[PDB]
Write a protein that binds this ligand. Structure first.
Ligand SMILES: [Mg+2]
Ligand SMILES: [Mg+2]
Ligand SMILES: [Mg+2]
Ligand SMILES: [Mg+2]
Ligand SMILES: [Mg+2]
Ligand SMILES: [Mg+2]
Ligand SMILES: [Mg+2]
Ligand SMILES: [Mg+2]
Ligand SMILES: [Mg+2]
Ligand SMILES: [Mg+2]
Ligand SMILES: [Mg+2]
Ligand SMILES: [Mg+2]
Ligand SMILES: [Mg+2]
Ligand SMILES: [Mg+2]
Ligand SMILES: [Mg+2]
Ligand SMILES: [Mg+2]
Ligand SMILES: [Mg+2]
Ligand SMILES: [Zn+2]
Lengths: 99, 86, 56, 122, 49, 137, 97
RNA sequence: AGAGUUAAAUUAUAACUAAGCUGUAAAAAGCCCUAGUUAAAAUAAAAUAACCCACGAAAGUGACUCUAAUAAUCCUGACACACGAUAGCUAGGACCCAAACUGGGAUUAGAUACCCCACUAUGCCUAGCCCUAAACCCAAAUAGUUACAUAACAAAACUA
């Protein structure tokens, strides 16, 4: 039986380190007419805009590539006890699964 | 007075219109803050009034820049919601 | 009122070797003439603790 | 160096310019300055017209004298260079090579402040 | 180290004999402290003009 | 067409002419725009006064001369008297902030005169003389 | 006996602190160009921290060095010196829109 | 705390031009020894920097340079000692500009007020007093805690 510290040591998210400038492949699970809701698998879905090139082949279940900056967008404003999560992630589109 | 003339606070017109150069000059004085300086130096303000005005301006600037930061943070959530009638 | 000489050769530059073979220009620069008031204060403080104190 | 003399002189020719510099440096040596070197920045048109010794000047030469001087004779130097008429503006500052550059290690990002107000419900 | 530095700095000091030659050299050799700084933090010298 | 806002420096070798004369040869229109009056004076490059007008000289009276229309008529009349003495281009300088600033500039434009440069020379004290006390005590 | 527990070490991924434009540099009152880059060309005013973007130490040293040059007669007051007009722009203020 | 200096204005006073200048929601009074431009001493005050938060015990201090310098191997402590914003007092000097008082002009039933014009003490320096403030950050000093815990509001509650 494996201990949980061993699983944290060998999890891919621990191997990620910094959340800035990381190339992560993700999967689109919901289609809004200009908005792509992409579950890259970490914690939250990110929202991207449909690009002007090859915009027809971004559908449900499509795998894309992302460059992560913040895994969860969250900030403090004055007069707030707790931070303000947006319940999203920040990532931009590079392309879709070049194979 | 002792300085060289016509170098400072001077703009030149382009292609024969002067109103555009005038709004350019007014933007220069506006970002440099000289316009409010001439408005506030028409009369004399006491140092107590000066301190109150600076405190009010600093408080308003802090609140406005932090509120604009919150608007810029929440601007990406203005999209149409995907889960209507869930 | 004790009187430090102008050629006192202030506190930080006393114990280094090879001073008296160096010419009058550097000795004049390192003396109390172009020193500040605080260097003279350190000189008076050192001389006074060596005058009155038991274990400096 | 210890002191630095920002010395703006009257715009004039080479021999009386050198003579004025000569008597300025002997005036420094009479009060007891140990001068390191002399610097010329050339002659330039002044930023503004400066009234000195019943005259209005627009062009002038810029000179620098750095020296070690006792703290009591700086007033005598300033008095003599005020009475000198071939100089338009003398000023004596502490030389910037006396102080050493303390470290800019970077800009520390300041957190937004917490706990300014109570946890009452508005 | 400072007294050895001040030993070699005293050789170029202006004296009564050295004053004429130093005035003549300084009036013939101008030098400027001017330099500019860039957005990347690099120093640009106007001596290349 | 690279155009620079900054003036053609007298010490520079910049080559810009307006009707054959250099930049500092062009006459000057001093525009003192106060909160109750606007006084307009065109003077030569050697600071010889060519013509003068004001809102009081244009037949307006006390509250009437503080408005912009009086400054506009003053600019038209001053440009007419400048054209009568025979000047085409003028460098205009504005002293003080008033309601007749726009009106004075466009009156000098519409009165048959050409402007090439506007300089705002407003008296800004570096905490100098103390001004008068504030109203509504 | 569990070797998979984390160690109490500091953060290894601390990217170093961002630096000012003149950071580990030396300011002066004799160089007119460097002092005059941080000055408005039309009016001669001194830009603040939100336009200049320095450490507070260097912002104070630039302010003192400018004002010393203003009094001592090395640089103009009412205008930027036009010989150094075409210097590269480090400030973030945009005058033409 | 001394000593030295003046950039932006402003002014005494001259030279050209004009018959008007100032004044407000609107007007009158005042000035026409006036107004604009160009030259400029003396005095007073120190834009921007400052969206900075430092120094001093507090009052207070942000134009520049130099000098001297910011107690205590650091607990509390008076009716003792030493300071103490502005306003005010005696003597000498300075007086650009502001201005209590006062005199005019508006407004009002009245206006010895709010609005406008001019001027005095005064605001400045030297020397001596006066020892007062919403001197308030209405939160005493020195060591500490986030345990118990919300009269209300405000700047959270508290131990020695
Ligand atoms: Mg002056
Ligand atoms: Mg008055
Ligand atoms: Mg009251
Ligand atoms: Mg004194
Ligand atoms: Mg009348
Ligand atoms: Mg006088
Ligand atoms: Mg100032
Ligand atoms: Mg202490
Ligand atoms: Mg005690
Ligand atoms: Mg008192
Ligand atoms: Mg008094
Ligand atoms: Mg008086
Ligand atoms: Mg009356
Ligand atoms: Mg107080
Ligand atoms: Mg009380
Ligand atoms: Mg107590
Ligand atoms: Mg309730
Ligand atoms: Zn830095």
């Amino acid at each position: 039986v494996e201990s949980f510290a061993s699983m944290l040591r060998h999890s891919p998210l621990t191997q990620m380190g910094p959340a800035k400038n990381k190339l992560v492949i993700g999967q689109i699970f919901h289609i809004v007419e200009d908005d792509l809701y992409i579950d890259f698998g970490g914690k939250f879905h990110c929202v991207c805009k449909r690009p002007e090139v090859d915009g027809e082949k971004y559908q449900k279940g499509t795998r894309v590539r992302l460059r992560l900056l913040d895994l969860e967008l969250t900030s403090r404003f004055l007069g707030a006890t707790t931070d303000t999560t947006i319940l999203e992630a920040d990532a931009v589109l590079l392309g879709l699964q070049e194979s | 007075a002792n300085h060289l003339k016509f170098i400072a606070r001077t703009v030149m017109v382009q292609e024969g219109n002067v109103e555009g150069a005038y709004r350019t000059l007014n933007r220069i004085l506006t970002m440099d803050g000289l316009i409010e300086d001439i408005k506030r130096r028409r009369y004399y303000e006491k140092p107590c009034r000066r301190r109150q005005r600076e405190s009010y301006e600093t408080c308003r600037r802090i609140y406005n820049m932090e509120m604009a930061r919150k608007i810029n943070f929440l601007m990406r959530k203005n999209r149409a919601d995907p889960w209507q009638g869930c | 009122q004790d009187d430090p000489p102008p050629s006192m050769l202030l506190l930080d530059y006393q114990n280094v070797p090879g001073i008296h073979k160096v010419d009058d220009v550097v000795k004049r620069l390192l003396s109390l003439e172009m020193a500040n008031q605080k260097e003279k204060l350190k000189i008076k403080k050192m001389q006074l603790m060596n005058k009155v104190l038991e274990n400096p | 160096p210890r002191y630095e003399l920002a010395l703006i002189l009257k715009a004039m020719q080479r021999p009386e310019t050198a003579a004025a510099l000569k008597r300025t440096l002997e005036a420094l040596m009479d009060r007891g300055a140990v001068v390191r070197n002399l610097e010329n920045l050339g002659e330039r048109m002044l930023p503004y017209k400066i009234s000195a010794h019943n005259q209005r000047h627009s062009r002038g030469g810029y000179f620098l004298v750095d020296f070690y001087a006792p703290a009591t004779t700086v007033e005598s130097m300033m008095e003599h260079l005020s009475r000198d008429i071939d100089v338009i503006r003398p000023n004596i500052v502490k030389h910037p090579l006396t102080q050493e550059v303390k470290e800019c290690e970077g800009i520390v990002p300041v957190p937004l402040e917490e706990k300014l107000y109570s946890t009452k419900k508005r | 180290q400072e007294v050895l530095q001040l030993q070699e700095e005293a050789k170029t000091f202006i004296t009564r004999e050295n004053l004429e030659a130093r005035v003549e050299e300084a009036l013939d050799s101008p030098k400027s402290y001017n330099w500019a700084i860039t957005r990347e933090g690099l120093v640009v010298r106007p001596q290349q003009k | 067409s690279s155009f620079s806002i900054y003036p053609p420096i007298p010490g520079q070798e910049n080559s810009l002419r307006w009707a054959g004369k250099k930049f500092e040869e062009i006459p000057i229109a001093h525009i003192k725009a106060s909160y109750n009056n606007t006084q307009i004076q065109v003077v030569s490059a050697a600071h010889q006064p060519l013509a003068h007008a004001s809102c009081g000289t244009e037949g307006f009276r006390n509250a009437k001369k503080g408005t912009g229309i009086a400054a506009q008529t003053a600019g038209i009349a001053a440009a007419a008297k400048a054209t009568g003495k025979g000047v085409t281009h003028v460098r205009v300088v504005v002293k003080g902030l008033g309601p007749g600033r726009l009106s004075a500039i466009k009156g000098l434009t519409m009165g048959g005169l050409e402007v090439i440069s506007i300089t705002d020379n407003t008296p800004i004290p570096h905490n100098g003389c103390r001004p008068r006390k504030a109203r509504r005590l | 006996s569990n070797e998979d527990l984390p160690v109490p070490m500091e953060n290894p991924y601390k990217e170093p602190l961002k630096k000012c434009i003149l950071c580990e540099k030396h300011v002066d009152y004799k160089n007119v160009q460097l002092l005059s880059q941080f000055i408005s060309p039309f009016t001669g005013c001194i830009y603040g921290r939100h336009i200049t973007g320095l450490c507070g130490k260097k912002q104070k040293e630039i302010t003192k060095a400018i004002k010393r040059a203003q009094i001592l007669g090395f640089m103009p007051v009412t205008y930027k010196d036009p010989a150094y007009l075409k210097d590269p722009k480090v400030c973030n203020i945009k005058y033409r829109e």
